[PDB]
Design a protein around this ligand. Sequence first.
Ligand SMILES: [Zn+2]
Length: 273
Amino acid sequence: KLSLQDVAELIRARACQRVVVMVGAGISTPSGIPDFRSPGSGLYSNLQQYDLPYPEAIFELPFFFHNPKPFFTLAKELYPGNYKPNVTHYFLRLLHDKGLLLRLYTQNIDGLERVSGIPASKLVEAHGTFASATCTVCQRPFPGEDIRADVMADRVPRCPVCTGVVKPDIVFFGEPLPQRFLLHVVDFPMADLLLILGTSLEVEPFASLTEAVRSSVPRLLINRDLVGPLAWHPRSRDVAQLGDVVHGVESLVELLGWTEEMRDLVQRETGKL
Ligand SMILES: [Zn+2]
């Protein structure tokens, strides 16, 4: 049974060269963006500021077509510009820069991974993006900017061709994940270290990707709690670092000897924005 130091040492020894990373809303709470499942701030305890029967409704089509206002409020809140990446993001950026990042798979829709510098080709925005929208009736595609004014004026965007509701390319329940997700067939077998951060792993097919790495491959989770196929299918090379995500990342970063480097990076980066 490995420790956090073991995993740092594996990287330091170049025993581990191809890291895949899975992330969820928990990596973006320090940036000020609420998740679903945190107490108090999580969407589960704030259904009225939002006017949802339950959190998942915001990503369900029946409720959306019934009432697109709550989703579009969130779209307003999350629209590129608004929040900034935090240290968790820049650590992932630094992983890339250090030649370690095979791929980063993300459930988030806040775009902060793009913003932090991680190039598109290293990214799999698994649950979609605000970078583009699709008319829900005629299926005509639109760049995200084309609907920015409406979203910002609290007006439901409309198709210029058919008047249908124009929906940002966020993956809703029961919709298919985007084509890039397919990279997991070759990414996961090829990976020699799996990092999991700030997710409840409550959502498929994204969650059971944790199962797709070889048994020889350590799975390091940095999260508030033990979650998903790591809490009920524990493997022998699993490591759990439980506590604040940013705190876990800091402990790791220091073990890797990356600290001044990551501070120069965070510093230079958040300034620009
Ligand atoms: Zn249309």
